[PDB]
Design a protein around this ligand. Structure first.
Ligand SMILES: Nc1ncnc2c1ncn2[C@@H]1O[C@H](CO)[C@@H](NC(=O)[C@@H](N)CO)[C@H]1O
Ligand SMILES: Nc1ncnc2c1ncn2[C@@H]1O[C@H](CO)[C@@H](NC(=O)[C@@H](N)CO)[C@H]1O
Ligand SMILES: [Mg+2]
Ligand SMILES: [Mg+2]
Lengths: 136, 136
């Protein structure tokens, strides 16, 4: 799993066209104030251990940032070893569930399988942009 | 080299604190309308051939998008095989020079060695977000 942690002042997205025939989540849009935006690329070796490490790390980083909202943002673009779409969707659902056991704020999992538009104002501080890899 | 191609409606950034002792570019800020924003991670194996492939590809993609501004945005976060900072800065300068031989619009190379804040409104169309790897 490859993640990009963007500490934002604000974030929004809208699904636009479907990127898979039959996206497994319905279309939507949402907008947020301050939030940790986690662009999340699920990779071929990713199982439940990987999901648990990622969830602990996101919770731990969110705490150090003192953020109370996490956006789990499915992203196809951070790796060239992608998990297949059905397995990736499953891992993202597990990550959301795992994060809620460790982190007490708002956890928003954005829909999987769509092209999206988005805007972000990303903060400028030293820990505002970090990347992470998890595996098992 | 790992790149992320973000076709934006608008883009802006400001350098904030230095991320290296002695950033090799001076601090600054800039804001743009529609632009191809290229987040660019220079990797250990990257030489002049790599820079030339990347420049051709960026020009080719910019043309297919019909964009007339490219932002070369140094980014430490797309790989776990980074080139050292001096070599990375050199490759980014070469990429800017190479791109200008192939692409006729505005080429903006953002300063290297700083933490930055930024905002982007990224477009929603199917080719609005792509990643690329180049090597030699
Ligand atoms: N291995 C993977 N890890 C995370 N997400 C993945 C994935 N494989 C497919 N997706 C999702 O399918 C959309 C089309 O690739 C992807 N959509 C996106 O990457 C949008 N932000 C593009 O605008 C994403 O929702
Ligand atoms: N191998 C590499 N490829 C591209 N850029 C690189 C690099 N090594 C260092 N940098 C630059 O140094 C700043 C601190 O890591 C980096 N700054 C950034 O990544 C900011 N956008 C963070 O807010 C970047 O300018
Ligand atoms: Mg809608
Ligand atoms: Mg300034």
């Amino acid at each position: 799993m490859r993640l990009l942690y963007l500490h934002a002042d604000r974030f929004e997205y809208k699904t636009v066209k479907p990127a898979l025939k039959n996206p497994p989540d319905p279309p939507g849009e949402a907008s947020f104030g301050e939030a940790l935006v986690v662009f999340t690329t699920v990779e071929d070796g990713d199982g439940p251990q990987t999901v648990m490490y990622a969830a602990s790390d996101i919770a731990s980083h969110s705490s150090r940032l003192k953020v109370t909202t996490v956006i789990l943002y499915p992203y196809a673009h951070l790796s060239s070893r992608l998990a297949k779409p059905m397995a990736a969707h499953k891992r993202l659902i597990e990550l959301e569930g795992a994060l809620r056991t460790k982190f007490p704020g708002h956890v928003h999992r954005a829909p999987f399988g769509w092209y999206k538009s988005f805007s972000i104002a990303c903060k400028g501080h030293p820990l505002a942009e970090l990347s992470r890899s998890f595996t098992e």
